[PDB]
């Protein structure tokens, strides 16, 4: 029932004690946009010290109720929330599209990851166990993972609903309360999650929302009743060898660069192509790039939406200008795009860019752009690429395309990237295990480790006999 | 063959590439003492930036060799190290006593923990595995725990050999190298571990030692080739109820206060005693305290050695003076002790102190002393104690003495302490699981969690089929 | 909308390919009853060899489809099944009462365990992973837990819907098909589960139901295409010491003996009471037993329903007759009960029995009755009870009532029972972890172990280098 | 110090109470041989019912002591046993060859796995923990893995010392005793393990040895005080595709067939070779097979020793005769071998056999020979091999040789074998994880699962509040 060019926020954008509330305090005002049209969908207040304290106080009170509930009870409520997310999926997805600009196609995938996340941690809540140890003379020791208390979740604008779910679901599962601060660019979708938690049966104040930027963030970090804060080198390389499957290598390169309008750090933007296939590959990539459907993100066939902001679009367009000044050849795009739909005339659109004759010294190769810009770097040998792509940090991903699996594993072994892809590339947030493949699951280690972030181990030792005095 | 009043360091105190070396660069000079006699056992150079660089560079080189060895090979070496520590135990324990001042009796327990710790992480090294996940169409995702590289360990003076062992054993078991900076108070024992690692078969420079203070520490933290750095409300309460086992409560109180000369934060120095037993308990506690054998730490019957240095002893005596000014009754000790052996005359000795008529407003009750000082606070009800001991942080321990186990579990539940003891109290470092009970073992969570600190998870996704393009 | 004295089966009681079917081959005929009224609710054919073959062949085909689906897809379906069980709970619970005779109070608790069980194994399906190991020279090894194929589940009459869910949920979560053979006494409720699995989206034939007894069972076990079969000394002691909480000890004794009409092996029927409290306890237990509401199991206030069938009721009454012949004093019950409601006149009712002056030589003390019969044995010392109750097997449970927790732990340590209760008793099936406490959860070991029963570990080794020939 | 043609057993071959004993009771007599010479090294008594009882009663007494020792103490003893095995390795390995006939080369590998096994389970013993669960109102539930009691380990003749170690280490690590029955062919080496356990500090009776056959085995299974018994369709295929690395494929085929004189079921004896490379491969395999050094197993350069005994050697030669009658071409070997050393003149030697023009209808292809016999079957397509090798059971292994990894993984997926090898083949016992690769480790799952086999989970529930009565 919701469409592009019509949405306007009509309710308060903070959320405390199970209801939408206006900030009690100001730390500034921000404007949220519909990137597809360039319309202001909200002029909202950033939360001040007093508003931040009301949220934390109200979450501390909920924490006391929720932490005392069983893992079984907590699981029940989180599984309900996942069911509500699943039922209201298209409504949630369209709202994320309206405010962020990603295609409905990509918003649905992010929403899926969100309710899957909830189910996973709900399951972990119901199956949590500590250790029990036997001590001589009937004595014993035991451990328990306990919540920390009020957790602060800091959002980002690229995956607003998903970052909200990903932070709250494990924190809540362990028995914590959370005060969530969305990115000021994207305030809207986090409130849908807040409402859903309430509807599911979460105690009022367990999941609170405070809008604001840096000042709000500082107030949250400095708060004495806040237990923990959950925040959110060379760029991600993609190595294409001459022996690879060309069609799959091209598909992978496009997915690596133009999903989420290339606005993510997990994007494999440094495309190293072997000299022999270099000409054939570039020809095919440009042909395919020029065919990407740009327009209204609510349209099912749209694959490229607008960029997050006008400042952001301008910054990306500046990278393109610097690249051709540094000697790169713009094969296609990197120009402002004006869509055929008149309602989209002032949207933050640009044609996806493919740059060739790229060098390691270039700032477009050295720096993360956060726009749809592919840098094609030519290479000759396996030793050369490994030497050129060594500067990759653990926090980044990497992709390798070669029919030789000895070569593939050898390249992956030497690469310092945390996530490596052989004959594929997935653009998925860092938190998601196994490179965010659809039918992957989460394994057990991801959950165990993220649970440890939102908890602490309490140890109890019960002496059944007499004390062994050294004195 | 080694005794008190005779030891003098005759070799360099830094350790690089399998040998004792002298600092290349200097950041100051320090004096290490024999606390039992007050003798200078070493005048050593604090490592400067160039010395810190040589250590990290030599360890970066060792890591490259060691990380490539199998977990089985790494286990083999760490098990040999444990065997050597076990064989050379008395020699290591006397060295620990000479520089630190703890009784031989307590030093042996710390050396036992140290070789047990190596055996544990050796075992984990041999049994480490990542996850394997199945993906549609014969594709698969998998994970590997990888070492980080060069890790920094920062020693403390209260458990020198044990802290060196505790930080280096997991770090090395993951495939990392380590540059260790002992407390400048206690430089000696870390070199015995250094030598043992070499003897066990560790590649040269895998476990390096840099002496120094804050300046050396800063150069280590600021070093770009350093992957990780492992560093070392109210104080620990002990609640004695009128229904408890008096003899066990007294034994527990003495252990909680006078082990390691009361110089640890783990010590349960805030002793809350119920009004009825208060008189009977204090009488027994003073009787038992006055019987603690003070003297040469290398003597088998010694239970109390000297304090770490003269500044620390003076600071502790200052606390006692302020306490009697604040209105506390010194029941015994808190005075400088002159041992009967003349060689021990300038040792940092004091009689263990018992203070009564203590208040929550007193600085001796509010502040951690790091000396043998017991503060006895009278209480009337269970609600009162819980309200008075609520200010305890998670990093601290707590002890409860009551014959009513419902009362015991109720008290432990309300207490915020990370380690709670029912009808006992163990003074053991926070790292040690299950309150450091002698025949406890480590369980599996401790090892798993500490391994995660010294490692990182690498994910590889192997696509067996074709790429599913969104475009 | 469903009530006692009106239900009659109107559909076939076998289930294959997503529909109810009449057995293709016979192995006899059975009659299922409404124990509350003594009415025949069904006359059904026991499955023959050809019918058993059709169900295993059908399951083998569904297995091939299901085992190829992802853990995530399997989880989705199982969570839908749990949702449907939860929605249709009262309808399932009344059906369980109608055929089995347990109170709706207990029936609801049984249906709760069933859908909780489903959710737990759905969660495990989505998080399943094998191991990944690194081998020298880039080679690697990995494991995968694979389904077995067609699994066979044998039902029991005391927990019909619960046993069906408990066996099918883990088997299905792994990727197996299941042919389920309910107890001929209770054929009805398993078909509600089979219909729910279908409704949830399970492939036709993944959960097939074959009616029959021993012959049907043998054919299933003998079948070559059946991977695995899941089947359904002294008796469970309850030790009441003179120092215990009398009211809690009485409540625990009633729960331990008269839940599920005392028709389970988990029942703590051997009640050892210390000489001093023996008189006081017996007086209170009889007073409380005589207050148990016997009647229509569909009534909310009913705590005791009828016994499974007339043969069973007669067998239990026989035990009571032998007991008074052996010298026991029937304090209350053990007599045929004729309920006030005329529609229940022909139901399998008896008054719950309390026997005193019991001896270890008595057959009522030596043998499991499977009826509401409590045997009170007097005892004098802790050493005496431990000697008299030592004959308890690991498969049984045990209960201890004492205010002294050292005594409690000492008794539990010496007892050979697999499940021990201190100051409580739960009557729960063996499969359920942590003595089947409400708000316990399942922990992680239970699920892990039961998943291992329904799966097998496949190992794959990928050689990346050259083969190291011994020759 | 020990050499071929000189060894004679001079001590009793049963072991009870920390000493070698003569069986109390008999069930026949057997002769043990030196397969290299054909000499009788022992004429020993098979254990009767009374001897089996004495061993069990003795073990039961040591269990009571050992089960009460801490996990830490058992670990210490098992690590000592591993150290003694490691020190006395060459002595144990020569004894293993003397009686079994495997090459000292392979015997040393067996002995390595043995002491590695002990270390792994020693580590698990020290780190064992149960679960702890929190229940409402301060109540709690906890689990503990307890030993079973007296376990029985049945030996095999192909890995005598290794099987003894593989069964005794997890049982003893769990707190059980074990009564071990070696294969009557190989009685000697198990006594070396028995002696070592004693020397390490194991209580007398912990690891007892009863010599005997099937009769002795039955007595052990039938014994009422025995808790558990640990016992020892087409054959293992090896698929060589035309696209593979020929030299590696040949090496792998020789390893798969001629290691342990081809006397194991894990040997990949069904060698399917693609029509194109068939001629080239056969030529190379025969060339390499003819170069295998047959002789004194104690000689360092020996790769093939004699077969276990005269009957086995004769049975294998019979298979070769039937094969050429069925139409197979003996390319090399399958003939009695007379070694140049005159002391080995009556040893059970034969030349390793290579058969070509093999059919699926042949008994040499259908049946497991347990001798050095390779059956080369020609094939044309991938679909054909998968159809011909489908009959492989889960208990068997499989090997695939192809440069195409998609093909390799596709073949491995379709194969029903429990262990699959890509571009390699390891002949290792089933118990060993990750196809028994040298620097593999055991991972965590293997140990977890073999501990569960030798233990039972005891659950304790502590009620802190009031009993919730249904009545």
Residue numbers in the entry:
A (entry chain B), B (entry chain A), C (entry chain C), D (entry chain D): 0 to 231, 256 to 494
Give the text the authors published on this PDB structure.
Human ALDH9A1 is a cytosolic tetrameric enzyme of ∼216 kDa that was first purified from the liver and characterized as a 4-aminobutyraldehyde (ABAL) dehydrogenase (ABALDH, E.C. 1.2.1.19). In the present study, using kinetic assays and affinity measurements, we showed that among various available aminoaldehydes, ALDH9A1 preferentially oxidizes TMABAL with the highest rates at very low saturating micromolar concentrations.
However, the three solved structures from P21212, P21, and C2 space groups at 2.5, 2.9, and 2.3 Å, respectively, reveal an ALDH9A1 apoform in the absence of a bound NAD+ or TMABA. The asymmetric units of the P21212 and P21 structures contain two similar tetramers (dimer-of-dimers) and that of C2 only one. All monomers are very similar to each other with an RMSD up to 0.24 Å. The αβE region is not visible in the electron density maps thus is highly mobile. In our three HsALDH9A1 structures, the inter-domain linker adopts a unique fold, never observed so far, preventing the binding of any substrate. The same fold of the inter-domain linker in the three crystal forms suggests that this linker exhibits such conformation in the apoform.
